[PDB]
Amino acid sequence: KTIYIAGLGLIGGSLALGIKRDHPDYEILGYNRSDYSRNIALERGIVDRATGDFKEFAPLADVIILAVPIKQTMAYLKELADLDLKDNVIITDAGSTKREIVEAAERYLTGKNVQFVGSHPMAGSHAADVTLFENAYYIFTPTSLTKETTIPELKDILSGLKSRYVEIDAAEHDRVTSQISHFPHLLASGLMEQAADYAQAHEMTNHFAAGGFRDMTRIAESEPGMWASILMTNGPAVLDRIEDFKKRLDHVADLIKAEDESAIWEFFDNGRKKRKEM
Amino acid sequence: KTIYIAGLGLIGGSLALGIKRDHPDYEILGYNRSDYSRNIALERGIVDRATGDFKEFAPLADVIILAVPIKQTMAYLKELADLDLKDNVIITDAGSTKREIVEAAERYLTGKNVQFVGSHPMAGSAADVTLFENAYYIFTPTSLTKETTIPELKDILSGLKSRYVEIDAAEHDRVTSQISHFPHLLASGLMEQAADYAQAHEMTNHFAAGGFRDMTRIAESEPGMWASILMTNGPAVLDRIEDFKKRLDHVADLIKAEDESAIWEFFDNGRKKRKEMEIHKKGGVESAF
């Protein structure tokens, strides 16, 4: 079997190793525009054959995994629709958002005898390391282009990831990830943005900050590009969390203005319980 | 010296040990309205003589440290105004908010003959002489703060191994609100939001990962303390709320505008700042729970 992985970055590289783990007879083809990193993946043998010309290996792959930024993923989906691929080949994504990518794939590959399903492999705590996806969720999002045999096949191909499979509607995935990941990042960056500006007029901001602030802002220190692209392709859900969050803030603001201490007390107590309720 | 600590909690307890640490000759008098913990403070050696009546040991103290809740702290400042205290006695608290406590102290104790200064000892890293190590012990000078007040305390509290710093009570609240009080409100608000959201989206609890947990951990702290903190630091927290709301609206504008580059800027600014302010090597606790 031949697998074409477009990406070879952190995600694409780890997916590569993870697949070889218990499938050392598969031919792994990779694509990467940067020469430098493409050659590294060739020494370390992350992939067998590589190219800087996406369409070069597309036609000879039984399964295609797009592991590049969301924007590039949809571009390649459309671009894949015009090449002559293998009959009924399996193609997947790797994006943090699902909805839009799935629509793009249905719009361009519908009518072309291909197999497609959405994919979101949630990484770990973090150069590929086959360990990256262990015990984390590998999420499948069914698409009109998903054939009843598509997912079972990938589950076998990806067994080396030691990941935990789950399937969910694309739209729901976006709503859920918005609530516990995308909106959270937005708040982190926002808090930091806030505290830094404030440090300018209140210089001790830089000195009194402690563990709470540190934990409230770490994810703010993460690759910008990817998070900008995520907010772009999941704006509706994130906008709804923003509007909902503002109301919650006004509610607490009201309570303070109303000097209602028992209410604020209940406010935090409910937070502590729910935090433990898991 | 006769040192009197009103609370026997984590803070009052640890303040007891840390003080005795470099002053084994000091007499530590304690108060706590709970017969039980008081007796754990004795067998354990923490203090040397305890009581359940605040007004008992007050008169024979050379320094009074109030380690009870914020409102309870102001009630005592008022009660101490009528007690007969050792002439020139030194009094402080340990509240996480400072402005109102100071106005309380000045309102009641002015004219009397005592020295008062605000205190806010932050935690580091039951009763731990280790709590405040290399953590900021904040002093907020008051009109009743005598030129000898802070130095005397600096010496007495030498055993805490803290980092003394002085600041206006109002600046303290503004700053603690920005790096703790509001951040705590955000963590509780987010937990609440996601919790209500899980009701209609079951995967919410499962997909939640490290990021979310770091963001909502502190929402697990003592409600009473935080309800009271927000109550005595309302002006600062409200302003953060208003400022934050505008920031959220901006980003929401950028999203509606499909301005991916401006959004890149937002997230890049955020990373850049946490990096430059070296927040990663920060640590400890602004409010010893």
Cβ contacts of residue A118 below 8 Å, gap of 6+?
A92, A93, A95, A98, A101, A102, A105, A139, A140, A141, A142, A143, A170, A173
Q: By the 8 A CB rule, do B192 and A270 touch?
A: yes
Of the candidates A28, A261, A209, the one whose C-alpha atom is nearest the C-alpha of residue B278 is: A209
CATH of the domain at A117: 3.40.50.720
Of the candidates A121, A140, A168, which is a domain's last residue?
A: A168
Q: By the 8 A CB rule, do B242 and A183 touch?
A: no
Cα gap A25→A2, rounded to integer Å: 9
Residue of A nearest to B197 (CA): A179
Cα gap A112→A15, rounded to integer Å: 26
Same domain, residue pair B58 and B189: no
Give, to the nearest 10 degrees, the angle between helix B182-198 and helix A235-257: 120
Q: By the 8 A CB rule, do B218 and B182 touch?
A: no
Cα gap A143→A145, rounded to integer Å: 5
Same domain, residue pair A179 and A126: no
Of the candidates A31, A29, A72, A36, the one whose C-alpha atom is nearest the C-alpha of residue A233 is: A72
Q: By the 8 A CB rule, do B179 and A203 touch?
A: no
Of the candidates B145, B174, B203, which is a domain's last residue?
A: B174
Cβ contacts of residue B17 below 8 Å, gap of 6+?
B46, B127, B128, B129, B159
Of the candidates A36, A23, A34, the one whose C-alpha atom is nearest the C-alpha of residue A63 is: A23
Question: Checking phi first, is residue B284 left (phi over 0); if not, alpha (psi -120 to 50) or beta?
Answer: left
C-beta atoms of A211 and B263 within 8 A: no
Q: By the 8 A CB rule, do B173 and B97 touch?
A: yes
End-to-end CA distance of chain B: 29
Contacts of A249 in chain B (CB under 8 A): 185, 189, 241, 244-245
Three-state secondary structure call for residue B166: strand
C-beta atoms of A193 and B122 within 8 A: no
Tell me how many degrees the CA angle B154-B160-B165 measures, rounded to the nearest 5. Answer: 45
Q: A115 to chain B nearest CA, in Å?
A: 26
Of the candidates A145, A168, A191, which is a domain's last residue?
A: A168
Q: Give the number of residues written for chain A.
A: 278
Overall number of domains in chain A: 2
Contacts of A187 in chain B (CB under 8 A): 186, 190, 215
**DSSP state string for chain A:** -EEEEE--SHHHHHHHHHHHHT-TTSEEEEE-S-HHHHHHHHHTTS-SEEES-GGGTGGG-SEEEE-S-HHHHHHHHHHHTTS---TT-EEE---S--HHHHHHHHHHHTTS--EEEEEEE--------TTTTTTSEEEEE--TT--TTHHHHHHHHTGGG--EEEE--HHHHHHHHIIIIIHHHHHHHHHHHHHHHHHTTSTTHHHH--HHHHHHHGGGSS-HHHHHHHHHTSHHHHHHHHHHHHHHHHHHHHHHHTT-HHHHHHHHHHHHHHHH--
Same domain, residue pair B149 and B57: yes
Q: In what order do the strands lie in the sheet with B136-140?
A: B118-121, B136-140, B163-166
Cα gap A25→A27, rounded to integer Å: 6
Side-chain half-sphere exposure of A278, counting CA atoms within 13 A: 5
The alpha-carbon radius of gyration of chain B (Å, integer) is 22
Q: How was this structure determined?
A: X-ray
Place of tokens 């994810």: A219
Q: By the 8 A CB rule, do A98 and A70 touch?
A: no
Three-state secondary structure call for residue B277: coil
Cα gap B173→B179, rounded to integer Å: 10
| Domain that residue A211 falls in | 169-277
Same domain, residue pair B168 and B268: no
Cα gap B143→B170, rounded to integer Å: 14
In this structure, which amino acid lies at residue B135? A
Q: By the 8 A CB rule, do B45 and B106 touch?
A: no
Same domain, residue pair B123 and B183: no
Three-state secondary structure call for residue B3: strand
| Test mutation, A126, A274, A276, A277, chain B, max B CBs within 10 A | A274
Cα gap A162→A21, rounded to integer Å: 10
Same domain, residue pair B71 and B170: yes
Residue A226, both tokens: 């990817």
Q: Tell me the pairing of strands B136-140 and B163-166.
A: parallel
Of the candidates B229, B213, B235, the one whose C-alpha atom is nearest the C-alpha of residue B289 is: B229
What does the DSSP 8-state code read for residue B68? S
Same domain, residue pair B146 and B179: no
Three-state secondary structure call for residue B19: helix
Of the candidates A201, A204, A241, the one whose C-alpha atom is nearest the C-alpha of residue B239 is: A201
Cα gap A276→A270, rounded to integer Å: 10
Three-state secondary structure call for residue B264: helix
Same domain, residue pair A6 and A59: yes
Q: Which of B203, B248, B268 sits opposite A190 (nearest CB)?
A: B248
Contacts of B243 in chain A (CB under 8 A): 194
Cβ contacts of residue A200 below 8 Å, gap of 6+?
none
Cβ contacts of residue A254 below 8 Å, gap of 6+?
none
Give, to the nearest 10 degrees, the angle between helix B223-232 and helix A235-257: 70
Same domain, residue pair B103 and B146: yes
Q: B26 to chain A nearest CA, in Å?
A: 31
Cα gap B221→B223, rounded to integer Å: 6
Same domain, residue pair B160 and B263: no
Cα gap A169→A98, rounded to integer Å: 9
Q: How far, in whole angstroms, is CA B265 from its chain's centroid?
A: 35
Same domain, residue pair B163 and B209: no
What does the DSSP 8-state code read for residue B218? G
Same domain, residue pair B111 and B191: no
Cα gap A271→A276, rounded to integer Å: 9
Cα gap A229→A84, rounded to integer Å: 29
**DSSP state string for B20-50:** HHH-TTSEEEEE-S-HHHHHHHHHT-S-SEE
Cβ contacts of residue B196 below 8 Å, gap of 6+?
none
Cα gap B138→B118, rounded to integer Å: 8
CATH of the domain at B228: 1.10.3660.10
